Design a protein around this ligand. Sequence first.
Ligand SMILES: *[C@@H]1O[C@H](CO[C@@H]2O[C@@H](C)[C@@H](O)[C@@H](O)[C@@H]2O)[C@@H](O[C@@H]2O[C@H](CO)[C@@H](O)[C@H](O)[C@H]2NC(C)=O)[C@H](O)[C@H]1NC(C)=O
Ligand SMILES: CCCCN[C@@H](Cc1c[nH]c2ccccc12)C(=O)NCCCC1CCCCCC1
Ligand SMILES: *[C@@H]1O[C@H](CO)[C@@H](O[C@@H]2O[C@H](CO)[C@@H](O)[C@H](O)[C@H]2NC(C)=O)[C@H](O)[C@H]1NC(C)=O
Ligand SMILES: *[C@@H]1O[C@H](CO[C@@H]2O[C@@H](C)[C@@H](O)[C@@H](O)[C@@H]2O)[C@@H](O)[C@H](O)[C@H]1NC(C)=O
Ligand SMILES: *[C@@H]1O[C@H](CO)[C@@H](O)[C@H](O)[C@H]1NC(C)=O
Ligand SMILES: *[C@@H]1O[C@H](CO)[C@@H](O)[C@H](O)[C@H]1NC(C)=O
Ligand SMILES: *[C@@H]1O[C@H](CO)[C@@H](O)[C@H](O)[C@H]1NC(C)=O
Length: 526
Amino acid sequence: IIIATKNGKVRGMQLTVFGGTVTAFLGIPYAQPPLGRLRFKKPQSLTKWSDIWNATKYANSCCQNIDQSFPGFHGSEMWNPNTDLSEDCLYLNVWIPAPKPKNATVLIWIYGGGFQTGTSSLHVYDGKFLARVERVIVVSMNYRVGALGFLALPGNPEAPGNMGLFDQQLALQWVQKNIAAFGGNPKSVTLFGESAGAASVSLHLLSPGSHSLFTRAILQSGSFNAPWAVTSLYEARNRTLNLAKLTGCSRENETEIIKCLRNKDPQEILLNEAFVVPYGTPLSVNFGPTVDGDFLTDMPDILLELGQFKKTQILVGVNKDEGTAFLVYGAPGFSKDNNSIITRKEFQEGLKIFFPGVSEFGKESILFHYTDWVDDQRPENYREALGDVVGDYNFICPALEFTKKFSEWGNNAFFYYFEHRSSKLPWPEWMGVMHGYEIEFVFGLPLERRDQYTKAEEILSRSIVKRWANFAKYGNPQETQNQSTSWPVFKSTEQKYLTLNTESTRIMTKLRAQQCRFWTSFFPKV
Ligand SMILES: *[C@@H]1O[C@H](CO[C@@H]2O[C@@H](C)[C@@H](O)[C@@H](O)[C@@H]2O)[C@@H](O[C@@H]2O[C@H](CO)[C@@H](O)[C@H](O)[C@H]2NC(C)=O)[C@H](O)[C@H]1NC(C)=O
Ligand SMILES: CCCCN[C@@H](Cc1c[nH]c2ccccc12)C(=O)NCCCC1CCCCCC1
Ligand SMILES: *[C@@H]1O[C@H](CO)[C@@H](O[C@@H]2O[C@H](CO)[C@@H](O)[C@H](O)[C@H]2NC(C)=O)[C@H](O)[C@H]1NC(C)=O
Ligand SMILES: *[C@@H]1O[C@H](CO[C@@H]2O[C@@H](C)[C@@H](O)[C@@H](O)[C@@H]2O)[C@@H](O)[C@H](O)[C@H]1NC(C)=O
Ligand SMILES: *[C@@H]1O[C@H](CO)[C@@H](O)[C@H](O)[C@H]1NC(C)=O
Ligand SMILES: *[C@@H]1O[C@H](CO)[C@@H](O)[C@H](O)[C@H]1NC(C)=O
Ligand SMILES: *[C@@H]1O[C@H](CO)[C@@H](O)[C@H](O)[C@H]1NC(C)=O
């Protein structure tokens, strides 16, 4: 229960899971805390320690703004940090099976949160279930988000950008140098992550400095080519400058601006973070990944287009109702507390809220493609169209387009379509299979019979956990034993994908074909 790592000894605790035992090491540091002179700069390597580090409770989450749009509502506070915020937050967790394995496949979790929110300590990211049931090692890390994590004055190492991504990269390095001690195979490592986490995994596939730190990759409702995932260098400047005047730190020696930003208090930096976007949307990414010339050598859509990425297998997928969650954070006429029937005019105003800097014609073109009903009199028509608009634009079509382009360079790719709504889901029914609500199935939570998941859900989670582990171990997401529908590879020709649900696992072709031609060919032009 003590492990000797490159930098010192760490003590963990033993857990009782499913009449078995999993060893957890919660909150191992992987970098010098980025305080003081180090705020905004790349993570610096951790140097030796004395004693036995006591890795028995989750560490501090990184500084971030909390979602207080629904106080006391579990559906949204389940995503708020469940641990003290602090700039001193660069820590990671390890869950190894007991008895200690010998050469276990490592699964590495990167959480989402629009690059502004997130912590590895959330209940639905607990890795003990996967360690128990599939005997993989599970690793998750905290990385700097928002301005502390992605503030950029490009080239200037005082705030170069992509620091949070470099946090992640530094944890991957740590698994490379230390996981064998824990019983893990450094040579068999799968990144997986969700939303902004998944966009992070995709960018690790492009970033040469990560190519040797993992082998395979899983992307859950996310990819770098999503319209929210990369901040432009034009915008990155506009936004750190807007933070400078907002804290009365405007200068002209650009370095003296950063030094001034280093004497502000985290919450005063947290505070003015919100208003840097001229017109915000529920999908706004105030401070995000930039083309920094260090982590990202070029605009990523071009690296993808030109085959410049790690050649390996990918598992990619999205949920049926990605877009609904965001409607109740700004869309007029919407609420988690009713069925949110809106009218044609409320829909049009909702586009103004989701596509603010977009021409009158572009918004008219969105309405035209999504409002040609079978059925004019259906009252939910506009309500469902605006959910689909946001979901297809922000998640589904980019995940599909990433998967085509990646597979066109010869690697195996597997696409799923999660369409089960969780029986415990706290948001209303009209919101459907929401953004984020497959994580708990991936992580094995329905396997706890003691927490009110239907039996169908238990089996579904059990099959998903198997398929995910078989992808991690063997590059092939099959469940080979219980006579399950085979999961075909995704090719740019066929475009076969696998649906995931409790009734029927079907193989279908060309998800959202007509919707995605609009988004990824026509719409980028207006
Ligand atoms: C569904 O609810 C929305 C919004 O919820 C209401 O907002 C509060 C102000 C209060 O009235 C609560 O009971 C609700 O939760 C309704 O949107 C409101 O609708 C009318 C006009 O459409 C008006 O009171 C407000 O302008 C709207 N809300 C705004 C501007 O935020 C909507 O009407 C409800 N629809 C159905 C079918 O129940
Ligand atoms: C000026 C406002 C900034 C909005 N910054 C987003 C962060 C974010 C979380 N995720 C994302 C995915 C893509 C792009 C951005 C984000 C924010 O806070 N949006 C509010 C809605 C958050 C939802 C609702 C709860 C459950 C569903 C998932 C998260
Ligand atoms: C870039 O950010 C600048 C601030 O540096 C924004 O300028 C403001 O824009 C809004 C309206 O769009 C107003 O508050 C003011 O008219 C602008 N302020 C100043 C000082 O000019 C600007 O909007 C952003 N650039 C865009 C949107 O193209
Ligand atoms: C680190 O942990 C040591 C071992 O803790 C022992 O076991 C745990 C489960 C508790 O029951 C604790 O009270 C036991 O002593 C401690 O002895 C030691 O003081 C700790 N040191 C630091 C610096 O945290
Ligand atoms: C673990 O497996 C790798 C190949 O994936 C092998 O090279 C390595 O020597 C093994 N290490 C063990 C069994 O300790
Ligand atoms: C101020 O800018 C100059 C170049 O414009 C640079 O040499 C100097 O380092 C900056 N100030 C500080 C304190 O570094
Ligand atoms: C296969 O089926 C059995 C029940 O017959 C079930 O208990 C087991 O968990 C299933 N395995 C997987 C990997 O789904």
